[PDB]
Design a protein around this nucleic acid. Structure first.
Ligand SMILES: [K+]
Ligand SMILES: [K+]
Ligand SMILES: [K+]
Ligand SMILES: [Mg+2]
Ligand SMILES: [Mg+2]
Ligand SMILES: [Mg+2]
Ligand SMILES: [Mg+2]
Ligand SMILES: [Mg+2]
Ligand SMILES: [Mg+2]
Ligand SMILES: [Mg+2]
Length: 257
RNA sequence: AAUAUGAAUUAAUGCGAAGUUGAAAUACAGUUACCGUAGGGGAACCUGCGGUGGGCUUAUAAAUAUCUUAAAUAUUCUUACA
C-alpha cells in the first residue's frame, strides 16, 4: 500500500496553508486530498503485482517504456511530481514544530546562480523566472508541470510537461501538444527522439537519460483554481517562484564533495 | 500253539586301509540339477513322461523444451522503517 508521506509542520499547514502561495483550503486540495487520491488509485492499480514494493519514482522508470502501463505511469509520475512541488514550496523542511521557528530566509546558492548565468547566456535569476512564467502560459494549455532541470552537461534548462509528464525520461516528457498544430522544427525534435529510441538494443526499447529536476511547479487546477481562479495561473506561478524553499532546491544540485 | 536256545542255510549293512575302471555332482561342471515313475546299462549313471527352482526377477532409455520493463529499480540492508 502506498501511503501519503507525512509533511513537516503539518499542523501549521492544515491551519495557515503555505504563506504567500496557497491558503489552508488550497493546500488541502493540492496535497491532503489530491495526494490521497493519487496514492489510493496507485495502490488499486499496483496491489497484487510486483510494482507494489517499489517507490513511485522507480515505478515510473520501470513502466516508462510500456504502452499499456501508461495509467500506472501517470499515477506514479503525478505522485512523484506533486511531492517535488510541495517540497520546494514548503516553509521549512526541518520540523520546527516544538522549536517554533519563524525565521526561514533561504536564498539561491552560489552554485545555482553560477549555473544560471552559464546556461542562460548571462541572464539573471529574475529574468529566468520571467521566461519560466512565459513558458508555462504558452506551452501548457491545460494541466501540466513546469520544471527547471539539469542535464548530463551541467546545463540548466526549462522543461514543461503536459498532464503527467516526467522530467527524467525524455521519451515521456510530453512537452509537445499534438492535439494542436506543430511546426516543422517540433516535428524534427519528435522524429529525432524516435530515432534515438530505435538505436537502443535492449528488448525493452529503453534509453539512458540523466536529466534531473531542480524546481517543480504544479500547473494543475488542483493547485491554483481555488485561490487564484481560471486565468490567473501566471500570478500563481510568479508567487511560487518567488517563495521557493532554497534549502531544498540547493540540495538538488550536485556539488561533488 | 507260544517262548527261549542252537542251527544247516541265506539276506542287508558299517568301518577300515587301498588301488582299479570311468568322470556322475559342485561354475552355464562343459547334455540345467533334482522329485515321482518306467525302461536300459561294468560302474557311477543314461533315456522317456510330468513336476520343482533348491538355475536364468541374472530384470536398467527409439535423445531432442518456451516471450516483458538487467537494474537511477533486484542483488546491499543489523531491531530500522513504520
Ligand atoms: K548329468
Ligand atoms: K527322476
Ligand atoms: K528320470
Ligand atoms: Mg560326460
Ligand atoms: Mg561331469
Ligand atoms: Mg551336467
Ligand atoms: Mg539307453
Ligand atoms: Mg525331464
Ligand atoms: Mg546351481
Ligand atoms: Mg536365484
Amino acid at each position: 500500500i502506498h501511503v501519503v508521506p507525512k509533511l513537516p509542520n503539518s499542523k501549521a499547514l492544515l491551519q495557515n496553508g503555505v504563506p504567500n502561495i496557497l491558503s489552508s483550503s488550497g493546500f488541502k486540495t493540492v496535497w491532503f486530498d489530491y495526494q490521497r487520491y493519487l496514492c489510493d488509485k496507485l495502490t488499486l492499480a499496483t496491489a497484487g503485482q510486483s510494482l507494489e514494493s517499489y517507490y513511485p519514482f522507480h515505478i515510473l522508470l520501470k513502466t516508462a517504456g510500456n504502452p499499456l502501463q501508461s495509467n500506472i505511469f501517470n499515477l506514479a509520475s503525478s505522485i512523484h511530481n506533486n511531492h517535488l512541488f510541495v517540497e520546494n514550496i514548503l516553509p521549512s523542511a526541518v520540523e520546527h514544530g516544538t522549536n517554533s521557528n519563524a525565521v526561514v530566509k533561504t536564498e539561491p546558492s552560489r552554485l545555482f546562480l553560477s549555473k544560471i548565468k552559464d546556461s542562460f547566456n548571462g541572464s539573471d535569476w529574475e529574468v529566468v523566472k520571467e521566461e519560466m512564467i512565459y513558458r508555462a502560459e504558452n506551452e501548457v494549455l491545460g494541466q501540466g508541470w513546469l520544471f527547471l532541470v539539469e542535464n548530463n552537461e551541467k546545463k540548466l534548462f526549462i522543461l514543461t510537461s503536459n498532464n503527467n509528464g516526467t522530467p527524467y525520461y525524455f521519451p515521456r516528457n510530453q512537452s509537445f501538444d499534438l492535439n494542436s498544430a506543430i511546426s516543422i522544427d517540433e516535428f524534427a525534435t519528435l522524429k529525432q527522439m524516435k530515432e534515438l529510441i530505435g538505436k537502443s538494443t535492449k528488448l525493452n526499447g529503453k534509453v539512458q537519460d540523466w536529466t534531473m529536476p531542480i524546481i517543480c511547479v504544479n500547473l494543475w487546477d488542483h493547485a491554483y483554481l481555488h485561490d487564484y481562479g481560471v486565468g490567473n495561473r501566471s500570478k500563481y506561478v510568479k508567487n511560487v517562484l518567488d517563495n521557493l524553499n532554497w534549502s531544498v532546491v540547493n540540495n538538488r544540485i550536485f556539488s561533488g564533495i
